[PDB]
Amino acid sequence: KVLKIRYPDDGEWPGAPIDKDGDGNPEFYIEINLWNILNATGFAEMTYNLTSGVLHYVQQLDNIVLRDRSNWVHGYPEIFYGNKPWNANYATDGPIPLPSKVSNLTDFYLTISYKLEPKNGLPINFAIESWLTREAWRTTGINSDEQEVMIWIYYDGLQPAGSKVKEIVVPIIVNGTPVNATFEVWKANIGWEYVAFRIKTPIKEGTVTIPYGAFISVAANISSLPNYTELYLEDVEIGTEFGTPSTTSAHLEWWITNITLTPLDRPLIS
C-alpha cells in the first residue's frame, strides 16, 4: 500500500491524510500545494509508502506561469502536523497538542531525515513553517495581525521575504553531531508578519534536529504584533518552496524518510 497524490491529474489541490491506525485522525497530511502556479505543463507526484514510511516527491514542471509574481515562489509541496490554517486539512494524532497557545506549549525537538535533489540550478529551500493565529481552528487563511515563522535548513538561490534583522546561533544536531549553527533572521510584512531563520550552512541531505522554541522565542521577541501570547501555534509544515519569477522550468525530486516531534520538559517560549 502506497498513498499517491498527483498534479494535475487529481486536480488543482492534490492532498491526502496519512492515518495509519485508521482512527479518522491523521498523523500527518500531505499536499502538493503548487499555490502560486497559475498554469504549467508536466506533473508533480508525491507517494507515501505505508510500510517503509518513505515520502517521495517527483516534480517535472515546465512552461510555468505564476498567479502573482510578487508572491515570488511557485509553491511548497509539503507534509505537515497540526491544523494548516489555509484549508480544512489537519493531522493531530501526535505527541504535541497543536494547535495550542504558544504560552501554553511545551518545547519540543523536530527531527527530519531527508534528501533533496533540485535539478538544473532550480532555486529551492527546505523549510519548516508554522502559522500563529488568533483562532485555533482557522481554515480560511491568515490576517494581518498574525505570524508566519519559517526555518530554512537548506537553500540554493532563494532568499527569504523582507529584511535581515540579525544573526542568532542555535544548538542543533546535524547527522548526529551537535553543532552551534548560525541562522540569519529575516522579517517581512507580506499581508501578515513573516519571520524566517535561514541557516548559514545549508544541509542538502541527512538528519537534522532543531529545538523549536529557540526559533519561536526569537520570533516572539522581534514581533511587531500585539498580544503575541494570544496566538495559537497552528502546525509544523515541512516542504520545499521552489522557483522565483526567473524560473519557468522546475524539476525537483526529494525524499523525507522520517519526521519526529519529541516533547521537552520546558516551556516553548523561554
180 in a known ligand binding site: no
SS3 3: strand
Residue numbers of the site for Ca ion (CB under 5 A)?
19, 21, 23, 25, 83-84, 89-90, 93, 139
Smallest distance from Ca ion to CB 82, Å: 8
19 in a known ligand binding site: yes
22/176 with CB nearer Ca ion? 22
Q: How many CB atoms lie within 10 A of CB 166?
A: 11
57/80 with CB nearer Ca ion? 80
Express the helix, strand and coil content of the chain in percent, nearest 5 each: 5, 55, 40
Smallest distance from Ca ion to CB 28, Å: 9
16/124 with CB nearer Ca ion? 16
258 in a known ligand binding site: no
221 in a known ligand binding site: no
76/90 with CB nearer Ca ion? 90
Smallest distance from Ca ion to CB 37, Å: 21
107/235 with CB nearer Ca ion? 235
187 in a known ligand binding site: no
Cα torsion angle, 69, 75, 81, 84, sign: positive
Q: What is the DSSP letter of 105?
A: P
| DSSP letters spanning 177-233 | EEEEEEEEEEEEESSSEEEEEEESS--SEEEEEEEHHHHHHHHHHH---SSGGG-EE
Please give the Cα distance from 118 to 46 (Å, whole number). 15
SS3 69: helix
Smallest distance from Ca ion to CB 218, Å: 26
**Residue 8: is the preceding peptide bond cis (ω within 30°)?**
yes
166 in a known ligand binding site: no
Smallest distance from Ca ion to CB 76, Å: 15
Binding residues for Ca(2+): 19, 21, 23, 25, 27, 83-84, 87, 89, 93, 249
